[PDB]
Design a protein around this ligand. Structure first.
Ligand SMILES: Fc1cc(F)c2[nH]ccc2c1
Length: 331
């Protein structure tokens, strides 16, 4: 027939057991606030869907991050706002503070709790192998929470992780691509950034789930323990799958197509080729070794799998030995 269906191993029916309004973001009404309450201070950076200002709530001299949305469809704003309000208060989840309108256009603007970013690049020549485990752990907290809240982030990557190194605080931000998981629903593959897309996005398997965030967590992991950025450095969505296959090899790629009966774009049928699965040792060198460990390589292997159902879950991730040291430390 056609593609074999899939279901999340965990948190599957979580949404079906909440009131409709929780995930039906289409029918959610926006409680707007007064942009007059904030004065833009300075610009912090650009972005695909938003320009990001530092701002002051003149109500109370509070520091704040304003993020002027770039125009999508009203149902995408409602989606982002809904999700942020559900996750609000959760571990390492960016806190949505108010919703206003850019006064000279109308483009809505989200207002967030302020988090100092420590230089996403200057924060590299100072990460010890413990730094990585710890922050990896902080991110998994955010992932188990939103999965367990029925939400896939769908855009995990270092740019969307804010770190305050001086105080070991970390916030997973920019939820504009997230979605609610529903069993049997088919999602858009054009999501997440190219270097981080899951195999299921590239082969066009639309009935994916939380475990796509887990694949991206592995692309983050690789690039950071090996100091290779990006790890899977694809020239486009097509090549990106070739770059993965060269590491994971084509045999498991074809087992994964076979078992889900995915229809491979014939474009691939010329460029994937045949490739063995290479042992992680080949990406270890003198400049990155202090961060590689059998613990760390095992854990990476158990995330970077074609078959989305066989990747570690966020919660399974947090029980791995690569975090034993961290787990005991919190206490
Ligand atoms: F997008 C926004 C959001 C705000 F809160 C603002 N305040 C003053 C300008 C402005 C623009």
């Amino acid at each position: 027939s056609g593609p074999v269906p899939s279901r999340a191993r965990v948190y599957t029916d979580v949404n079906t057991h909440r009131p409709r309004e929780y995930w039906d973001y289409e029918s959610h009404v926006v409680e707007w606030g007064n942009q007059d309450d904030y004065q833009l201070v300075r610009k912090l950076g650009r972005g695909k869907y938003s320009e990001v200002f530092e701002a002051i709530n003149i109500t109370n001299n509070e520091k704040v991050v304003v993020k002027i949305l770039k125009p999508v469809k009203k149902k995408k704003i409602k989606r982002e706002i809904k999700i942020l309000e559900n996750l609000r208060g959760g571990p390492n989840i960016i806190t949505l503070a108010d919703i206003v309108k850019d006064p000279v256009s109308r483009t809505p603007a989200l207002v967030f709790e302020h988090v100092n970013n420590t230089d996403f690049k200057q924060l590299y020549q100072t990460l010890t192998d413990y730094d990585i485990r710890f922050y990896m752990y902080e991110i998994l907290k955010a992932l188990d929470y939103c999965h367990s809240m029925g939400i896939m982030h769908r855009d995990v990557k270092p740019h969307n992780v804010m770190i305050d190194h001086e105080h070991r605080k970390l916030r997973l931000i920019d939820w504009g691509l997230a979605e609610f998981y529903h069993p049997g629903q088919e999602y858009n593959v054009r999501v997440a950034s190219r270097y981080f897309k899951g195999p299921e996005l590239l082969v066009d398997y639309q009935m994916y789930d939380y475990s796509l965030d887990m694949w991206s967590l592995g692309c983050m992991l690789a690039s950071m323990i090996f100091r290779k950025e990006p790890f899977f450095h694809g020239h486009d969505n097509y090549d990106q799958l070739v770059r993965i296959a060269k590491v994971l090899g084509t045999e498991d790629l074809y087992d994964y197509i076979d078992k889900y009966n995915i229809e491979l774009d014939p474009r691939f049928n010329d460029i994937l080729g045949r490739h063995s699965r290479k042992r992680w040792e080949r990406f270890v060198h003198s400049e990155n070794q202090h961060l590689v460990s059998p613990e760390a390589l095992d854990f990476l292997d158990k995330l970077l799998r074609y078959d989305h159902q066989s990747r570690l879950t966020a919660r399974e991730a947090m029980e791995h030995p690569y975090f034993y040291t961290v787990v005991k430390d919190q206490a």
